[PDB]
Amino acid sequence: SHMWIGVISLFPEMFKAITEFGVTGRAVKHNLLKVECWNPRDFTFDKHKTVDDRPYGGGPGMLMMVQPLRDAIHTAKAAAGEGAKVIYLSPQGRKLDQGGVTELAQNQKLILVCGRYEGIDERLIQTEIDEEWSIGDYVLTGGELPAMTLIDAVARFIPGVLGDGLLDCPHYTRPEVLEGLTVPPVLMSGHHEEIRKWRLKQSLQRTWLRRPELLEGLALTDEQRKLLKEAQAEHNS
Template identity: 40%
Template sequence: MSDTPKSHGRKSIRASLQPRDLMEDRADLARAWTAQVITLFPDAFPGLLGESLTGKALKDGIWQLRPIDLRRFGEGKHRNVDDTPAGGGAGMVLRPDVVGAAIESAREMSRGRMPILYLSPRGRPFDQAMARDLAACDGVTLLCGRFEGVDQRVLDHYEIQEVSLGDFVMTGGEIAAQALIDACVRLRPGVLGNEASAVEESFSDGLLEHPQYTRPAEWQGRTIPEVLLSGHHARIADWRRAQSEELTRERRPDLWKAYKARRG
């Protein structure tokens, strides 16, 4: 088994036997936002990240993906990565020496500001503000848990921030990692076809997005609100703001409370 993690991106998949070409590839991707993912299932990546806008940006070298196979750092003949919980209990826990070795390998390939995050249901809720912060970094290293989680000493030693997608439990962190990466990559310059989309969508200003409509003008007896067909941009903007506020007030009182507090 190779000790070199696979890298996904436009430059990393171009075959070449010329050392100069390889050097130019590394130089070109040195500016790309980088997602390192420590996982027991590296073949799960890029998954949906290889499709649509994120997939195009990956091929264009706007960002790059480095899945790091946790299993290759395992102990013994069978590459064991886990052990029974200290103090007893059900399930297995990922070993600190194994995870630590994987993190050290990831850090050797890191550059600039690349925080290490652990996808965990007990972590800080992931939101659009965090996505913006991470997108402004040079990249991120994501640790995907399995079984009963990761030895706490690893999290403490590397000062790893725990991040949660919501108040639910999944079988592992891979799906959560892909969701987090998608939310960050789409905020990178050059990924969205219309840069204004990132400004107008849900959570960009603390509110849910207003309803959207398109042709035909009438469907199943339902019509597009007249104001959207008026061509009066100020009235349209006011209508959209009012709709966003009403939806947020009804569906997300937590967001509405924070929004009102910011407005004084």
């Protein structure tokens, strides 16, 4: 179930951050994940390899120049063959969450278009882009970090890359006592069922306290309902 991701970027060397390091670097070396980049600058024809252009209507910014970007996209589409979804990363896109990650991970091929400057021509979005996605409600200097974020997130779903809507439970490792703070005795008990229930209760409690809206989106099991009620009762002393 390997995955191919084509990238359109003025700064393809940025993607070394995910292709050369850690779990995603291993995925690439083991051919579980392939990331292939095209740079609009390589598709320019003028002496100074111009990749930006002035916005109609004026304004302080520049846009990506249409012809080099369009040609790079077309080249990526030809390399991908049939079935590749083309994604543009921008704050105007659908907000990414883990459900959206699972949806995107169903694709065997993606092409990610990374904007720079003030963005890209709206008509390219209409004619070349299948979906717009955002990694969050904030503005960055380029689409490369959003693209890498998406790649990393979906790569976790590729079989072989790694070894319920709630926040994670607390985790502990050595030493047993750290600046006077002890490990919860249950985690030392060797009682697997008690440990499982403790972790679940902690996850429910943390989700309730920090992100209560996330709970509203869940259909809690009988056990989860019980443990959440216990946690809420204890919180209220």
